[PDB]
């Protein structure tokens, strides 16, 4: 899986920088965040505190839906990604 390994990387990379480079952001409450999505595809917004979804959603991992104010991985791969990884 080329692909999949691009959003693998795609995912353990951005979570290095969270964990080593971005003081504004727990790493531990970004892989909380991202756990969530391992029992359910598609959530309500309020699942994830704002700072965290608004970051994940800068960096390509998660879609908000405004009409339904939900939050999905950005794709499947994303998603597949973080169930292997999470």
Do not use: C
């Not at 359910?40 to 908000?64: A, D, M, Q, T, V």
């Amino acid at each position: 899986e080329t692909k999949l390994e691009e959003e693998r990387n795609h995912l353990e990379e951005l979570l290095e920088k969270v964990e080593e480079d971005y003081e504004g952001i727990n790493y531990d409450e970004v892989l909380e965040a991202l756990k969530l999505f391992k029992d359910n595809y598609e959530l309500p917004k309020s699942k994830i505190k704002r700072k965290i979804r608004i970051f994940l959603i800068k960096e390509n991992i998660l879609f908000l839906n405004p009409q339904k104010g939900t939050l999905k991985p950005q794709s499947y791969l994303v998603w597949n990604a973080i169930k292997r990884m999470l």
